[PDB]
């Protein structure tokens, strides 16, 4: 039961301290060199404990002259066992004379009673120092203490990548050292006589055979461990994943009646295993762990209160981490190594305990994958996933592909708590401006959401002294508080703003909240997708959709086209002809040359009619953008959608015109108009393909994309710069 491990100036460590160990400690990270160095440090310390000749470790820097390894052992249970008046034995008295004798004879009669016998925890500290001349020194100059500590807190290391299934040495080592039997009372002669009596035709034949064999094979006598192993083997009835399972089960079972607490390290438990196999392994370990637990009403024979040993895992599989988090819960922790700016291993704790039972039950592989990331982007809606995960868009920016995007709500963000592991896993939370400010039409005043109030309270810092450069934050907070009323004026019947633009306020709040890892977009995703500079591309995409997806419903195209041309007017009745001729179909048949020409002429006439109507009904060319981004489930300027406007009963003419456009001409676009339909991916792919065809150079196409889409490109560039700043540290 180790509590603290400290390493100073060794290998890749400057000053690293590990504490607050649990039963199911798990180690993850990108810097495998740090894990290897930690394992080497532990093995070196335990080899020097047992007086073995090994090579001393190297120094991180040569401007020092010492390297220290410090270990702290929680010697509380052993003290309670030994100091009791009931236990009178050789081993107990020897342990007291070795561990608790020196530290207790220097205390008076006041500290011993009622001050160290109620709830105190006893600690033992051992320090190992390596000098510049390859000299090794101990803080305690007594080999007996080191031997007792080694035999009371054994260390076991398991490597699964290179493991031999034909060797059972760890199993026998665990069995031999976790028994409460004295095997020296079994005399050889009586056992030989018993075996001879059991199998013999003439008395004494087996004994004579054994004597003749021994007289020829005379070698060194058996040691105690060999004798106990032979006795166990003759007693039992028989002899990668299975070996590890057996080791863990034996370790858990045999320690329930002993005061020896081993420490186990396991490397890559999931090598060459199915995910279901790893999940079953963790589940079986948890079931065996819970079988021997005696807490509260759970009592009876076979249930104990003995503490469990410490287990460390080195894994690269999200499945094992997910199972460990879901099953063990409060009895586990997650460690992250990473590096530093100049190059040095770190150790941080990642939050893995959740107070929400729904989150634990709904825990899946995406949450575990969030652990194995170097930059997380949190978004609310499902359109952000469709926009940021586009393959063509990420092809041109080989720096945002190293970040993972996750959909999280307020409760999900609170449960995850990304701020705890801020130095290990950088993150950014992207939200909309509507989450902070709410605008109304009937009452000409803004309002502040509770999230804005919480952010203001967090930014406000009482109990502080003066600091230059901090008064600006206070002034901004005061302005945000006083902008509560903010009387304004809306034109076009509560549709636009006189002069606010929602841009200066957004920039100021972004500057204020950058310290909290937040970014508030001026508009929604659909607002950024279609802007005043993207109208030609949107129109071209609509035209391509009309040209391709629209096909003749009738199996015979020529006869149907001729009949509908002779039945409906080509100019005045173009809309009914388009509605009754062309339909959306997955398969696009190839027609004759004359039929293709007629279809192309009809499509061109329809395109001309729609563009003329669009440019005639609306004049300022901004209401076109507003209608386009509002029909695709969006809000603009006033933060109002179709349902909100209908409930508010405002802008009747605009809503009626939009309804007429939807139900009269753009009937084919309607299925690709609801939320989470797939128009974002198609539009992005078409735009990227067009710009790639037009411009060959990567710089030119990137510049054109930045010009067409300012906001999303700015977000991507900022994330890429943040990743590049911390690329060296978060990379093995």
């Amino acid at each position: 039961t180790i509590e603290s491990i400290r390493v100073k100036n060794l290998l890749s460590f400057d000053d690293v301290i590990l504490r607050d160990f649990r039963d199911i400690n798990c180690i993850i990270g990108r810097n495998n060199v740090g894990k290897s160095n930690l394992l080497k440090v532990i093995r070196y310390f335990y080899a020097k404990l047992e007086n073995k000749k090994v090579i001393p470790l190297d120094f991180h820097t040569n401007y020092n002259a010492v390297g220290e390894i410090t270990f702290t052992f929680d010697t509380t249970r052993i003290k309670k066992i030994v100091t009791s008046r009931k236990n009178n034995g050789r081993f107990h008295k020897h342990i007291y004379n070795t561990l608790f004798k020196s530290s207790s004879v220097k205390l008076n009669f006041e500290e011993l009673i009622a001050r160290k016998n109620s709830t105190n925890k006893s600690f033992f500290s051992l320090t190992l120092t390596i000098c510049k001349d390859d000299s090794v020194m101990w803080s305690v100059d007594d080999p007996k203490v080191r031997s007792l500590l080694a035999t009371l807190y054994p260390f076991l290391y398991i490597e699964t990548r290179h493991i031999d299934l034909y060797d059972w040495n760890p199993i026998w080592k665990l069995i031999s050292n976790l028994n409460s039997f004295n095997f020296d009372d079994v005399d050889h002669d009586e056992l030989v006589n018993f075996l001879d009596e059991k199998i013999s035709s003439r008395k004494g034949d087996y004994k004579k055979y054994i004597d003749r064999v021994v007289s020829v094979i005379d070698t060194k006598p058996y040691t105690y461990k060999e004798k106990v192993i032979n006795y166990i083997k003759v007693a039992i009835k028989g002899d990668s994943n299975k070996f590890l399972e057996t080791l863990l089960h034996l370790l858990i079972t045999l320690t329930r009646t002993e005061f020896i607490s081993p420490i186990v390290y396991i490397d890559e438990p999931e090598v060459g295993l199915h995910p279901k196999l790893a999940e079953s392994f963790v589940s079986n370990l948890n079931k065996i762990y819970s079988k021997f637990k005696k807490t509260s009403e759970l009592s009876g024979p076979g249930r104990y209160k003995t503490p469990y040993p410490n287990i460390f895992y080195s894994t690269h599989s999200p499945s094992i981490l997910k199972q460990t988090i879901k099953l063990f819960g409060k009895d586990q922790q997650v460690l992250h190594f990473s590096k530093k700016k100049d190059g040095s291993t770190r150790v941080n704790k990642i939050n893995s305990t959740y107070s929400d039972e729904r989150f634990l039950n709904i825990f899946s592989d995406n949450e575990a994958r969030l652990f194995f990331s170097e930059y997380i982007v949190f978004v609310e809606g499902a359109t952000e996933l469709e926009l940021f995960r586009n393959l063509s868009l990420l092809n041109l920016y080989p720096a945002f592909s190293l970040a993972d995007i996750y959909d999280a709500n307020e409760v999900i963000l609170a449960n995850i708590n990304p701020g705890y592991s801020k130095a290990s896993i950088p993150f950014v939370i992207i939200k909309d401006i509507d989450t902070l400010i709410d605008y109304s039409i009937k009452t000409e005043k803004f309002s502040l959401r509770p999230l804005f109030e919480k952010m203001i309270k967090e930014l406000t810092k009482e109990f502080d002294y003066y600091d230059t450069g901090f008064g600006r934050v206070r002034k901004e907070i005061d302005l945000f508080s006083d902008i509560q009323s903010s009387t304004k004026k809306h034109m076009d019947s509560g549709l636009f703003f006189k002069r606010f633009s929602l841009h200066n306020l957004s920039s100021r709040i972004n500057k204020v909240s950058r310290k909290l890892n937040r970014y508030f977009m001026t508009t929604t995703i659909e607002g950024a997708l279609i802007n005043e500079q993207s109208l030609p591309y949107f129109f071209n995409w609509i035209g391509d959709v009309i040209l391709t997806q629209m096909t003749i419903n009738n199996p015979n195209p020529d006869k149907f086209i001729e009949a509908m041309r002779r039945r409906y007017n080509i100019k005045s009745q173009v809309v009914p002809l388009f509605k009754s001729v062309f339909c959306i179909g997955l398969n696009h048949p190839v027609y004759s040359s004359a039929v293709d020409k007629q279809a192309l002429r009809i499509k061109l006439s329809f395109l001309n009619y729609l563009k003329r109507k669009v440019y005639s009904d609306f004049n300022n060319e901004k209401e076109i953008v507003l209608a386009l981004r509002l029909a695709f489930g969006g809000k603009t300027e006033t933060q109002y959608t179709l349902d909100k406007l209908r409930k508010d009963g405002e802008a009747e003419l605009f809503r009626e015109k939009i309804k007429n456009y939807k139900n009269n001409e753009l009937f084919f676009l309607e299925p690709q108009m609801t939320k989470t339909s797939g128009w974002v991916t198609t539009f992005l792919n078409y735009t990227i393909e067009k710009i790639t065809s037009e411009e060959s150079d990567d710089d030119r196409i990137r510049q054109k994309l930045s010009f067409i889409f300012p906001e999303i490109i700015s977000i991507i560039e900022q994330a890429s710069s943040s990743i590049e700043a911390e690329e060296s540290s978060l990379t093995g």
Partner: protein, 368 residues
């Protein structure tokens, strides 16, 4: 790092000495008309003018040059991440404690030692023609010819911005020597500025013997340093350093504790008692604290009885906030290392609660 001609041409000297480079003129030294002569007891502090070519060069050297040369971990002063608590922490594992001080640490730093220490990191070339070298040009911005100490020549004076880094770089060699000496004896060594702390975890009288003092003096004599015989302390099982008490009853595998004396907290307790007894803020800020608003500092009369009150309120709240910050720094140090007595933790928690309540009361009274 290796500074060459272009580095000094662009980074170290961007605009202050650009006029003297094209004209092929030697970089002047710091004259006696640009440095003040502040006095405090038997100590002399040299202050340079805030508007001078050398001040900007010193700041640039401190930020870009004197921040990458490796140091020794035994030095925990004037280094990022270092603190007095980290200077006292390693000695909790020891049973015997010894303290030593260096006499005239900054005044005894030889200039040639500084030049030799900084030579490997500066390219050997002539900055200005064939008259002045780059190393000499850089070093002329850190030294000063003291009129009162003309016998010793020119030294690096206390009060300049680049002095602590130069001191650490110079004393790195001595720190290495002392650490190597102490490692063989099993003694933990730490240094803060010119104070050395030694701790022995074993049961022995090595730190109470004259042999240790003789060895330290012999080591320090290589570079011309001396110890102060009036500040030598050697004790067992308990030591007090400026109100910080380190205790360890002894024994194998024993861990000590660090606390603060009652005298260390006397002033804050007196201030809290006076504030709870409704004492005027003028008396509290003048008697207990040493803050006083002189009438000469007043520039414009305007209104009289409104700026003194707010000045005193701000000074009181700043003092309370600073002491609260100090106490919670102690709490954070405990959380990181867990080497603080529990009763002291309870006491400081109560004191922090009382201080926060007093600050809230002061703010409410000011608002009313």
């Amino acid at each position: 790092i290796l500074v060459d001609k272009v580095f000094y041409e662009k980074i170290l000297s961007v605009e202050s000495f650009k006029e003297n480079i094209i004209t092929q003129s030697a970089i002047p030294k710091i004259s006696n008309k640009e440095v003040r002569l502040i006095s405090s007891g038997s100590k002399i502090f040299y202050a340079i003018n805030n508007t001078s070519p050398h001040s900007h060069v010193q700041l640039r050297l401190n930020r870009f040059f004197l921040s990458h040369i490796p140091l020794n971990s035994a030095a925990k002063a004037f280094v990022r991440g270092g603190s007095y608590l980290k200077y006292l922490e390693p000695h909790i594992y020891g049973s015997s404690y010894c303290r030593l001080d260096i006499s005239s640490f900054f005044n005894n730093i030889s200039f040639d030692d500084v030049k030799q220490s900084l030579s490997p990191y500066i390219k050997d070339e002539y900055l200005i023609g064939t008259e002045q070298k780059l190393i000499d040009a850089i070093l002329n911005s850190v030294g000063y010819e003291s009129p009162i100490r003309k016998d010793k020549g020119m030294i690096i004076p206390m009060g300049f911005r680049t002095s602590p880094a130069i001191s650490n770089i110079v004393f790195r060699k001595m720190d290495l020597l002392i650490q190597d000496f102490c490692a063989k004896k099993g003694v933990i060594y730490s240094r803060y500025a010119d104070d050395m702390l030694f701790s022995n975890p074993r049961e022995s009288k090595l730190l109470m013997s004259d042999y240790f003092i003789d060895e330290i003096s012999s080591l320090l004599s290589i570079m011309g340093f001396n110890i102060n015989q009036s500040k030598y302390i050697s004790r067992e099982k308990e030591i007090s350093i400026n109100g910080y008490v380190i205790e360890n009853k002894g024994g194998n595998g024993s861990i000590g504790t660090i606390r603060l004396s009652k005298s260390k907290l006397n002033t804050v307790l007196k201030v809290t008692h006076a504030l709870a007894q409704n004492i005027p803020y003028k008396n509290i800020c003048n008697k207990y604290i040493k803050v006083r608003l002189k009438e000469k500092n007043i520039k414009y009369e305007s209104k009289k009885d409104e700026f003194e009150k707010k000045y005193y309120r701000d000074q009181l709240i700043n003092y309370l906030g600073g002491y609260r910050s100090y106490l919670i720094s102690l709490v954070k140090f405990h959380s990181e290392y867990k080497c603080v007595n529990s009763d002291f933790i309870i006491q400081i928690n109560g004191i922090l609660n009382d201080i926060q309540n007093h600050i809230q009361k002061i703010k409410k009274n000011r608002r009313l």
